[PDB]
Amino acid sequence: AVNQSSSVEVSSESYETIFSQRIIRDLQKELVVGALFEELPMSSKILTML
Amino acid sequence: AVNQSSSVEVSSESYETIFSQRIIRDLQKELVVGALFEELPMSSKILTML
Amino acid sequence: VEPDAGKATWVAASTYGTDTTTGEEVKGALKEIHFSTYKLAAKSFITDET
Amino acid sequence: EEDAIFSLLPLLRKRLIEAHAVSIEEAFMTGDGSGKPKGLLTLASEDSAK
């Protein structure tokens, strides 16, 4: 199981090391449909066109 | 457990917590037979006297 | 390292009172990743007579 | 936020906007019309352009 680092005596316990607070992520998807036309402004919750 | 909440906010598992570099020790038994009797200096291997 | 997360839910249109049934996000488990190091050592020799 | 990285509010908002962005993309790609827009993939099936 665990043995890190039993060489030859100072084995420690809870894995005394260091850690990084950097967060990373790979690719994200290509947002092609998010910008296909302008945001047409409406003052009202319905609108009509003749 | 460590992993709390889980509806719904971003929370991790372990190795979030701060660690400490100080070492503590219990109150060991006092030292007395190793530091009581007088030393006799010698300069060979065996000492003889009459 | 963050994971993929992920959606939201559209309102039921006529829901205007408390609550409007707004769903919630996908629980982003902020998972650890770790590294390891191995050692190599090579040795060579010669003698004074050679 | 009293035992973590003292900084989860940036991490929460970057994911929540991404979750909104992918949700509007999904609805624009695919939509029945149940509380949501009428996304493109099924939309051409209505006027039977397939």
Side-chain angles (χ1 to χ4, degrees), chain D residues 4-48:
Chain D
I5 325 180
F6 304 93
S7 55
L8 272 59
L9 181 145
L11 184 57
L12 181 56
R13 67 179 59 241
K14 69 179 284 205
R15 185 175 66 264
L16 190 53
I17 63 93
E18 215 260 9
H20 281 286
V22 75
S23 191
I24 66 177
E25 174 210 319
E26 196 278 292
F28 297 161
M29 293 291 283
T30 25
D32 53 358
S34 69
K36 73 181 74 58
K38 285 292 299 293
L40 306 182
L41 273 62
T42 197
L43 184 60
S45 199
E46 197 163 2
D47 25 324
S48 283

Side-chain angles (χ1 to χ4, degrees), chain A residues 20-37:
Chain A
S20 285
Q21 296 175 334
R22 75 186 287 245
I23 302 175
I24 34 69
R25 78 208 311 230
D26 207 310
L27 197 116
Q28 283 93 107
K29 187 191 288 183
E30 314 93 336
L31 285 305
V32 69
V33 296
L36 50 69
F37 199 82

